């Protein structure tokens, strides 16, 4: 619907299509195009619900690396070892927060 | 298995696939795609061991 990029695949976000990652390249560009895809939906919940911007996500261990390995602020393109999140589930399932949101 | 990238080489990580290094280019982009492969497994040992 309104969160598509017009040439997108409608319900999947796959890092190998340049329209989904916005023309992104290698990793820091690619994953940071998730963090925009994950904003664009947390916004669109504010339109449908009329309550508020998307307040949480739940997600597989794989995307939580993609969240943990990328600079989540506004900076250039960065990658590395998964840092700010609890990527494993033993200690706890709750892993970090994104940008305090 | 769960640590694959659907087009990868299934048991070897070779820096010459565009799929494995995540479309990385030159080195700093490329070698940082290892560090993400070594995380993706180090996490997956938390799933199998518990």
């Amino acid at each position: 619907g309104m969160t598509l990029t017009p040439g997108s695949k409608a319900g999947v976000f796959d890092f190998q299509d340049p329209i989904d990652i916005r023309g992104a390249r290698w990793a820091g560009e690619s994953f940071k195009a998730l963090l925009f895809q994950i904003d664009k939906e947390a916004v669109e919940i504010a339109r449908q619900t009329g309550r508020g911007e998307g307040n949480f996500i739940i997600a597989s261990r794989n995307v939580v690396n993609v969240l943990a390995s990328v600079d989540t602020g506004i900076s250039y393109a960065a990658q590395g070892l998964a840092t700010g999140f609890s990527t494993d589930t033993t200690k706890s399932v709750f892993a970090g927060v994104l940008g305090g949101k | 298995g769960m640590t694959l990238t659907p087009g990868s080489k299934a048991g070897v990580f070779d820096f010459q696939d565009p799929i494995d290094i995540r479309g990385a280019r030159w080195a700093g982009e490329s070698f940082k795609a290892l560090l993400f492969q070594i995380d993706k497994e180090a996490v997956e040992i938390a799933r199998q061991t518990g």
Partner: peptide, 25 residues
Amino acid sequence: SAYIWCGWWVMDEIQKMTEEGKDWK
């Protein structure tokens, strides 16, 4: 369509093929 990541060394070859009168690129 699809997506194949090719470096500029293939595009250096391709811009050398068609600018030297070759037939495919």
